Design a protein around this ligand. Structure first.
Ligand SMILES: CN1CCN(c2ccc(Nc3ncc4nc(Nc5ccccc5)n(C5CCCC5)c4n3)cc2)CC1
Length: 304
């Protein structure tokens, strides 16, 4: 459906401030000014680095329709595009930013219920992509956004194909053979889970990217995060098995983390955890009305 992708003119929006960047481009907070109206509506804008040829223009556009068709509570939808000298991609602006920064800025003031729910929600978004027969290729905590603390959304879907290789996130077959599959996405999911559980540690810190295939081939893996019980760590290790088909499926990952979320303290050990709990319904309802009206599945709660 082509109607899911608004074609914007450079006159209808402005970039206002830089929010971050990646291998792809620079992300700005922007203002959309509609249609002979006064108002300025905040948006997020990724401007791609290399200038766009017209012929590739069709190629980018074809991919953009797919990106705009992504409809799930846990994956960010591409809203609009502007094609010029540059390709500009328009999406919802999220006051809370990316998950990687969030867990860093809240290090150790985050409860087992939040961490285990995020893991569930990430697995639900990835599962949806798999169901659409789509592969992300660049899952990482930096590409998951926080809509509210209770609701996270994978972003950056589809550009990796569309146009700095994240070797430390990559399944070994992707490093060696540039093969990308749902099962390599599962590998990067394991790394993403590891970033959350360490409150945003850098994976294989201090180790050159060039050495990573060798240490993987030797059966070395990211170390067990100190808050993680063994069952949590074994799931991560399973995500990083050499045989791609031995790795869990995202549908299994949804089930396992959901079950752990029902008994959060049995699976993560966090000091002060009883002092930390999911928002009361009162606080959840207020958040939804102010900044998260979109339909979504219930967060998994503790049985007791
Ligand atoms: C000192 N910190 C102050 C606050 N800060 C910040 C950054 C971003 C947001 N929000 C926000 N929203 C939507 C985004 N959509 C993409 N990415 C994106 C990807 C593809 C197409 C369009 C946007 N981003 C990226 C991820 C984080 C940096 C910007 C987005 N970021 C809120 C606060 C970071 C610096």
């Amino acid at each position: 459906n082509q109607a899911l992708l608004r074609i914007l003119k450079e006159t209808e929006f402005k970039k206002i401030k830089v929010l971050g960047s990646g291998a792809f481009g620079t992300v700005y907070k922007g203002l959309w000014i509609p249609e002979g109206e006064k108002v300025k509506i905040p948006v997020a804008i990724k401007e791609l680095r290399e200038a766009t040829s017209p012929k590739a223009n069709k190629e980018i556009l074809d991919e953009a329709y797919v990106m705009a068709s992504v409809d799930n509570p846990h994956v960010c939808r591409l809203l609009g595009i502007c094609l010029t000298s540059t390709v500009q991609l328009i999406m919802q602006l999220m006051p809370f930013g990316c998950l990687l920064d969030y867990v860093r800025e809240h290090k150790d003031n985050i409860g087992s219920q939040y961490l285990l729910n995020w893991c569930v929600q990430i697995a639900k978004g990835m599962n949806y992509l798999e169901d659409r027969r789509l592969v992300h290729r660049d899952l990482a905590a930096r590409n998951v956004l926080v809509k509210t603390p209770q609701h996270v959304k994978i972003t950056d879907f589809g550009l990796a194909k569309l146009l700095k290789v994240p070797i430390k996130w990559m399944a070994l077959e992707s490093i060696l053979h540039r093969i990308y599959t749902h099962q390599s996405d599962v590998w990067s999911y394991g790394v993403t889970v590891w970033e959350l559980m360490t409150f945003g540690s850098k994976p294989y810190d201090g180790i050159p990217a060039s050495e990573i295939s060798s240490i993987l081939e030797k059966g070395e893996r990211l170390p067990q995060p100190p808050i993680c019980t063994i069952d949590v760590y074994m799931i991560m290790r399973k995500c990083w098995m050499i045989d791609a088909d031995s790795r869990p499926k995202f549908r299994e990952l949804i089930i396992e983390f959901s079950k752990m979320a029902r008994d959060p303290q049995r699976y993560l050990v966090i000091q002060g955890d009883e002092r930390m709990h999911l928002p009361s319904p009162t606080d959840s309802n207020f958040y939804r009305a102010l900044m998260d009206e979109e339909d979504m599945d219930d967060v998994v709660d503790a049985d007791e």
